[PDB]
Amino acid sequence: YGRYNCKCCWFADTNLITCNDHYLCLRCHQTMLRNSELCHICWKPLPTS
């Protein structure tokens, strides 16, 4: 993996689920689940649990 901050929102450090090729927060996980299941940063599907 790369750097240890969030790929989307950049300003969170703890409790991060390792997605496909990028870090990601619990806050902005939910503002992508309602739009799609396919992501819009890596354009590849992400873990569910």
Binding site: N5, C8, C28, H40
Partner: protein
């Protein structure tokens, strides 16, 4: 005394033809003594060239060599008490006279510095001689060798080749510094090697001044501090710093507090102090009129073209100047137009209503000659007045258009048709409406722009286009063009200039204004729906800032919809942020100003300060600019109203921060649409000078006039030396006086001494050692005719005419044969206007003064009642006259207007005449030429001529005969100013001048120093020296691309890796540092060359930056009189008025380094000192930094062990960096998310696209020479705009703006033209050479006509390759021409005659057929010479639409014609050949009358196929296959993948295959290269080798997946 016998017989071969050489030689032969031999027998060679320039021009040489004051007193002329000069040749007659001086030089370096001194010495003779009542004509004669006619060029080199020993023998047998400059003057043709050793062999004398320099300038530097003593200093310093000055709060950085900034920005921007309105349209004045147009007409004919045809004949009939003035040649074709108007009134029942209010005449209005609305009835007064003044006016001018005239006319009867005044009143009484009113000097209803549907907003930009085009060609009007009626609340408009602009199929609008020119106007716009006029307002602007929108609805709506579509992650946010961007985009274009440019620039500093983590403390006190008017607030509520909207809401409004960043940075660059022009230059130079002078008198150093050659007085010196030791004052541990110039000398000691040891990452190793026309004056830069040209070409024209009527005795000037001389050498009645209309107003107002003083000179050439007191002579006439000293420079603002009418209105005397007499004999112009404006309506120029008429302008000497510094003026070729003995500060010759200018950058004015000719030569040495020094360094990146690339590759991987990367900048990095600092650095360097490991001497550099310490910076002359009329620079002047009151024209300094002079010599200083500071953090804060520098920008990337706890590092770095006067501007930002470097903003995980610089640069840079050259630059910038992945659609719509601006330019169309549309993959793989194939194979859309020429290309190309010759002698068959080379090749490959029948009938009309399109050998030679050898757009587009409709296309016979005459010379050929694409492809039968222009298109299609086979592929040949969803905003990077079938390294191989092409063309000027070099030399449209000698130069393309899966495929 060994050649003393030879010399008298050597020069016996010059016959004393006059008295000039006869007394010279009889005192030569009678003196056999070398003590006067080399003075008096040396003064004949100066006497010999002196006769050549007096035999050349009209002249009488001064054989007495005496004064000017008594050469006028041999005539009866009273003594004027002139200054004292000696002229070297004259010619006097009447009350004018021709001075000529004479001097010959060899090198360019000290030739122009005699021209500039001689010309300044002669042009400061007029001011006592203008008062004498006489004007003179000055000339100079530059000679670059000895080219006499009276000798035969074989004896003069024997003189200087045998007198070159006689002075060495003369001063060895028997004065010091007057010797070797005489050698360098008497030396041969000097192709002289000039270098660092040129300084080395002079004298190096002293003054007992430079010791007081070194007493402050080298003292504390020892440079050899031990490397274990510095650590014990540094730990104490940090321990002092942290406990002393940090914790009591003096640090420059902080922790950014991300909530306070958004409250700070709302209080910054939303001007709740101001009282502006909420609606945007109400406040601005042009959006008002746009809203009135777009909702007065959106909610909702053979006589026409006959009228247009005869009016378009009236246009060409005006431009002749045949009717002896410019007044009746308006009224005459006025009479013609009004008779032809009433000649339509008698034809139909309804024509003047149904077809004339529907077109060209509104209520009581008429359209005619220039663009003039004339509004009938005043003509009826003026025409009746004209027939009243002359009883029979149309009886001679009725058909004076036959004799001395064209006599090609179509005016049947309207030449002679006397208009029945009793007939026009029926028409004039028929249509009457309210006359046009035009405003000078409260409720709202505007439908709330966010609440209008998504279609009619395009009807705002569409109307902005149509108004803006009429703004643009409101320059096209003639600039001379005085009206017929001359003369501030609200004015009803009698007649005016106007444009027309169409909106629908019934109605037009209008655009009324009074002034012509390029300056600001005061417009008004009406409508005309079906005959009814309706006013809609008045606004006030300047035209030339509105080039941008001119055809660009679809551009400005493709990028504002490209950009909004980025925000498909929050739909409810998108439908809000959409229509609030668009009003912004509209409002910026509708208001170009500096203030609403600068504020929009200042938001990219905010934005890095909101994503990153530490800003400088002073930034919010710098983003503010005072809104001077109530229109800069409308933008400063909607940008800020956008930034509060989507940066941070009170909730978690940071879902996808990256697109917010991209989308808002692209708003901060959306600034750039305003045209960089600095709207007026007399308010620009004052800001430039005032930005220069402020950091100087604050430190207190500026001086007045030095002597410009060495010496300085003591009082002038002491302020210099006090500034010097105040510079090096700066004790190391005081927190006061930290923002102050200077260097801490004890710390620079450490900085250079650790560099001596090899412990920095740079080291003093230094591979491959460095030790190996019109020229302006310097007080006015930015202008295009300086003072010195403008008398030079005048005096040259005076001499060129003064002889040509004394060759025969004409003694009369033709008033155009005197305007053929100037108007040629600055840049037959049709020829003059053919090259008169290609000027600019800036040159027109110079040309008129040239016409003035030329004709005044010629009027003075031939010559040998004040009781009109209505307004008094006593304090009005004589007062302004003596205050201004010329009649020439008179202003108009001391009087009223009507006195200009009435003091003109004295009756005729001997001051006037009648019968204006275009023969114009000489000796009468002083009374003839004033009548030319007595009869024309204008008055003021007649006032100036009537004022200029009536006299209203009022043995020791044998020791001294050898060249002493008093005996300098005895020779012309002495070369008085040669470098002989340089000093510590000067070079015995000059004082290293400079000059002022700005640079017209985007936000703020960058300055720019103009150097003179020696100054550039002495600056190249230091600059290239330090370039070689920094060549061996490791971390600079200014000139090396590769290290810059490594830094970019580092920053990309390092933001992805959790580092802390700063981004600094430096406020006034230019004007702060000092040349003495570079002296104090080069004292203690080593620079041991690895060839000979030794400490080299840099005294060639150490003695020449001392010169750079002491430059003489001039001042602009426009600010020498702008502060003179009426602000701390003005305070600085008006405290130097209280001294001895000389005007302050020369400023020696201490601390300049103007930007671009010592440029690379500070790039290593910003690398040496940067690495020293980079070492101070490896030892005091256990990290590992690395620090690039581009001489103005830095980045120091830091790893940390194991989050902004270590502010301590950064602030302490700031405190050290302030100790070397590298100050850190408050613009900088340091954090861990964003880093810039030279505007390439490198976010986490990506690169930021930055769309809106490329479009905004592509809509500009429309430069106009030929309409294919103009369709090359925009193809290049469309290659760059797709290098960063915009889309296809915006590229596909720049390519219609550029297309229609050509179709608007009269050109018609051609199959090449602008580049294609709907082009998708041909950006990555292939050049303009690939795309023109796709343009031409788009015509043959069934693709059944060009597959066969590709079949022929397959049969030729597999056989013209290797392994086979098969006519490699085809170099001749192409050179036949274009019509029959294809017939050669095709029947070479083989088919019937019927294929040649069905191929050669396709023809395109060429216009660059024989020659090229003329608007005042192929392009291959002029391109290859460029590998061999080494004003606004919107006023440069009108000269492309004025000199293209004129006589501009040529045949092979000598002459030119029109385009329409060619395009009238064509038939109609409906039979399916022309109906393929109309007006593009023709038949062969339809080009029957004009058949010398029809070339085939199939010839160039085969030409492109055989070029692209050379450069790539074997897939130029295949059938184009049919192409094959993803999200709109997933783009990724691609590479070229081009399969090249040549071998590389073509940097020389092209010239050595031009012997085997054309011997005479190489005379005057591989494996497959040569077959596609004659396919380029025969035409112009191929362009092959400029894409082979270089490379693709991007190779890194990024493309959208939905622009990459949609593209086509051509495999093999």
């Amino acid at each position: 005394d060994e050649y003393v016998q030879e010399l008298k017989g050597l020069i016996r071969k010059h016959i004393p033809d006059r008295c000039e050489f006869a007394h010279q030689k009889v005192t030569f032969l009678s003196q056999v003594h070398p003590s006067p031999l080399l003075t008096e027998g040396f003064k004949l060679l100066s006497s010999l060239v002196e006769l050549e320039s007096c035999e050349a021009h009209a002249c009488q040489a001064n054989t007495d060599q005496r004064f000017v004051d008594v050469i006028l007193s041999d005539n009866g002329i009273l003594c004027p008490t002139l200054p004292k000069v000696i002229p070297d040749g004259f010619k006097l007659t009447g009350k004018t006279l021709i001075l000529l001086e004479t001097f010959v030089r060899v090198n360019p370096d000290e030739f122009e510095k005699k021209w500039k001194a001689d010309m300044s010495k002669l042009l400061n003779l007029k001011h006592d001689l203008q008062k004498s009542g006489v004007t003179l004509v000055p000339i100079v004669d530059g000679r670059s060798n000895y080219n006499n006619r009276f000798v035969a060029d074989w004896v003069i080199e024997r003189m200087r080749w045998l007198l070159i020993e006689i002075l060495k023998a003369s001063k060895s047998m028997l004065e010091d510094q007057e010797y070797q400059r005489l050698i360098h003057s008497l030396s041969n043709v000097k192709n002289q090697s000039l270098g660092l050793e040129n300084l080395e062999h002079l004298k190096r004398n002293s003054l007992d001044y430079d010791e007081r320099l070194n007493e402050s300038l080298f003292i504390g530097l020892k440079g050899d501090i031990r490397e274990s003593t510095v650590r014990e200093e540094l730990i104490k310093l940090k321990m002092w710093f942290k406990d002393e000055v940090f914790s009591k709060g003096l640090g420059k950085f902080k922790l950014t507090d991300r909530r306070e900034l958004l409250e700070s920005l709302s209080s910054l921007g939303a001007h709740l102090d101001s009282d502006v309105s909420s609606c945007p349209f109400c406040n601005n004045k042009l959006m008002e009129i746009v809203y009135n147009v777009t909702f007065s007409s959106v909610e909702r004919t053979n006589i026409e073209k006959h009228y247009l045809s005869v009016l378009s004949l009236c246009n060409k009939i005006k431009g002749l100047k045949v009717f002896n003035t410019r007044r009746n040649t308006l009224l005459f074709l006025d009479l013609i137009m009004v008779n032809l108007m009433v000649d339509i009134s008698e034809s139909c029942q309804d024509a003047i209503e149904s077809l004339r209010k529907s077109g060209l005449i509104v209520g009581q209005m008429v359209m005619l000659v220039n663009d003039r609305v004339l509004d009938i009835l005043e003509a009826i007064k003026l025409i009746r007045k004209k027939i009243g003044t002359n009883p029979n006016w149309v009886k001679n001018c009725s058909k004076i258009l036959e004799r001395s005239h064209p006599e090609i006319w179509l005016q049947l009867n309207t030449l002679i048709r006397q208009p029945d005044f009793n007939s026009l009143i029926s028409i004039a009484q028929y249509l009457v409406s309210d006359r046009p009113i035009m405003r000078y000097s409260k409720i709202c209803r505007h439908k709330l722009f966010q609440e209008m549907s998504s279609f009619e907003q395009m009807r705002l930009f569409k109307t902005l286009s149509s108004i803006s085009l009429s703004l643009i060609n409101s320059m096209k009007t003639s600039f001379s063009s005085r009206l017929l009626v001359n003369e501030f609340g609200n004015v009803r408009l009698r007649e005016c200039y106007a444009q027309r602009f169409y909106l629908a199929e019934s109605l037009v609008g209008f655009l009324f204004y009074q002034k012509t020119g390029e300056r600001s106007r005061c417009y008004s716009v009406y409508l005309s729906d079906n005959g009814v006029m309706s006013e809609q307002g008045s606004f006030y602007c300047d035209p030339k800032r509105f080039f941008l929108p001119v055809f660009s609805d679809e551009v400005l709506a493709g990028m504002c919809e490209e950009m909004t579509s980025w925000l498909d992650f929050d739909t409810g946010l998108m439908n809000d942020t959409g229509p609030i961007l668009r009003l912004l985009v509209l409002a910026i274009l509708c208001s170009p100003s500096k203030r609403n440019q600068t504020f929009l620039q200042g938001l990219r500093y905010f934005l890095m300060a909101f994503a990153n983590q530490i800003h400088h403390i002073d930034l919010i006190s710098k983003l503010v600019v005072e809104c001077k008017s109530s229109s800069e607030v409308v933008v400063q509520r909607l940008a800020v109203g956008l930034f509060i909207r989507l940066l941070g809401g009170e909730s978690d409004a940071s879902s996808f921060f990256s697109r917010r960043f991209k989308y808002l940075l692209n708003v901060s660059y959306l600034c750039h649409l305003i045209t960089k022009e600095t709207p007026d230059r007399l308010t620009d130079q004052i800001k430039c000078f005032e930005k220069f002078i402020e950091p100087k008198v604050k430190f207190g150093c500026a001086v007045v006039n030095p002597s410009l050659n060495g010496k300085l007085t003591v009082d002038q010196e002491d302020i210099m030396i006090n500034g010097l030791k105040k510079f090096f004052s700066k004790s190391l541990r005081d927190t006061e006086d930290v923002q102050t110039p200077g260097v801490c000398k004890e710390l620079l000691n450490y900085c250079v001494s650790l560099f001596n040891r090899g412990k920095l990452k740079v080291s003093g190793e230094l591979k491959n050692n460095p030790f190996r026309v019109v020229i302006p004056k310097l007080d006015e830069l930015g202008n295009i005719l300086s003072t010195y040209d403008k008398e030079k070409l005048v005096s040259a024209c005076v001499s060129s005419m003064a002889e040509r009527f004394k060759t025969k005795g004409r003694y009369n000037l033709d008033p155009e044969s005197t305007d053929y001389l100037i108007l040629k050498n600055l840049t037959s009645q049709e020829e003059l206007s053919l090259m008169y209309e290609t000027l600019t107003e800036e040159q027109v107002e110079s040309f008129n003064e040239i016409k003035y003083d030329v004709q005044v000179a010629l009027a003075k050439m031939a010559d040998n009642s004040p009781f009109g007191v209505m307004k008094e002579i006593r304090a009005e006439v004589s007062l302004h006259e003596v205050k201004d000293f010329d009649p020439d420079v008179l202003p108009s603002d001391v009087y009223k207007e009507l006195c200009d009418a009435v003091y003109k209105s004295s009756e005729k005397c001997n001051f006037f005449l009648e019968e204006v007499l275009d023969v114009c004999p000489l000796g009468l112009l002083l009374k003839n030429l004033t009548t030319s404006s007595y009869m024309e309506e204008e008055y003021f120029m007649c006032f100036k001529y009537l004022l200029i008429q009536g006299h209203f302008d009022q043995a020791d000497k044998l020791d001294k005969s050898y060249f002493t510094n008093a005996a300098l003026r005895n020779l012309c070729f002495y070369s008085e100013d040669s470098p002989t003995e340089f000093t510590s500060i000067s070079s015995n010759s000059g004082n290293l001048k400079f000059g002022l200018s700005y640079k017209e950058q985007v936000g703020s004015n960058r300055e720019l120093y103009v150097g003179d000719l020696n100054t550039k030569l002495m600056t190249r040495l230091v600059e290239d020296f330090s370039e070689a020094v920094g060549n061996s360094m490791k971390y600079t990146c200014l000139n090396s691309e590769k290290e810059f690339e490594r830094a970019i590759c580092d920053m990309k991987m390092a933001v992805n890796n959790g580092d802390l990367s700063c981004s600094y900048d430096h406020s006034k990095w230019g004007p702060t540092m000092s040349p003495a600092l570079f002296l104090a650095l080069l004292q203690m360097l080593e620079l041991r060359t690895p060839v000979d490991r030794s400490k080299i001497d840099l005294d060639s550099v150490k003695s020449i930056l001392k010169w750079h310490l002491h430059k003489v910076v001039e001042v602009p002359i426009n600010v020498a009189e702008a502060y003179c009329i009426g602000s701390l620079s003005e305070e600085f002047f008006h405290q130097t008025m209280q001294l001895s009151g000389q005007i302050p024209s020369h400023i020696m300094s201490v601390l300049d380094m103007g930007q671009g002079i010592l440029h690379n010599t500070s790039d290593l200083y910003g690398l040496i000192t940067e690495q020293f500071l980079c070492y101070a953090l490896d030892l005091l804060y256990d990290v590992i930094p690395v620090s690039y520098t581009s001489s103005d920008d830095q980045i120091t990337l830091v790893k940390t062990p194991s989050a902004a706890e270590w502010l301590e590092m950064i602030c302490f770095h700031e405190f050290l960096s302030s100790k070397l006067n590298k100050f850190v501007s408050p613009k900088s930002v340091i954090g861990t998310f964003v880093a810039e470097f030279k505007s390439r903003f490198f976010v986490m995980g990506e690169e930021t696209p930055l769309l809106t610089k490329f479009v905004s640069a592509a809509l500009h840079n429309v430069k106009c020479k030929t309409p294919t050259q103009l369709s090359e630059t925009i193809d290049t910038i469309c290659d760059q705009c797709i290098a960063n992945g915009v889309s296809t659609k915006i590229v596909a719509r720049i390519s219609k703006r550029v297309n229609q601006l050509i179709r608007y330019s009269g050109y018609g169309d051609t199959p090449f033209g602008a580049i294609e549309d709907q082009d998708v993959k041909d950006w990555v793989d292939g050049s303009r050479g690939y795309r023109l194939q796709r343009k031409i194979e788009a015509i043959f859309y069934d693709d059944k006509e060009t597959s066969f020429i590709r079949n022929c290309a397959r049969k030729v190309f597999n056989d013209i390759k290797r392994g086979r010759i098969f006519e490699e002698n085809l170099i001749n068959l192409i050179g036949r021409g274009g019509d029959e080379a294809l017939t050669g090749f095709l029947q070479y490959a083989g088919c019937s005659e019927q294929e040649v029948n069905r191929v050669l009938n396709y023809r395109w009309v060429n216009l660059s057929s024989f020659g090229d399109l003329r608007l005042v050998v192929p392009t291959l030679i002029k391109t290859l010479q460029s590998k061999l050898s080494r004003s606004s757009v919107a006023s440069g587009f009108i000269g492309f639409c004025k000199s293209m409709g004129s006589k501009c296309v040529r045949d092979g016979k000598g002459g030119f014609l029109y385009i329409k005459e060619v395009y009238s010379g064509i038939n109609v050929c409906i039979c399916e050949i022309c109906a393929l694409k109309p007006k593009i492809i023709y038949c062969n039968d339809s080009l029957n009358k004009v058949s010398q222009f029809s070339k085939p298109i199939l010839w160039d299609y085969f030409s492109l196929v055989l070029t692209n086979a050379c450069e790539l592929g074997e897939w130029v040949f295949s059938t184009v296959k049919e192409p094959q969803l993803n999200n709109q905003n997933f783009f990724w990077a691609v590479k070229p993948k081009v399969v090249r079938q040549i071998e590389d390294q073509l940097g020389m191989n092209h010239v050595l295959q031009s012997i085997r092409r054309n011997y005479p063309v190489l005379f005057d000027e591989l494996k497959f290269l040569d077959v596609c070099i004659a396919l380029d030399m025969m035409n112009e449209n191929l362009g092959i080798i400029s894409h082979l000698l270089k490379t693709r130069d991007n190779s890194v393309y990024i493309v959208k997946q939905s622009d990459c899966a949609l593209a086509h495929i051509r495999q093999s």
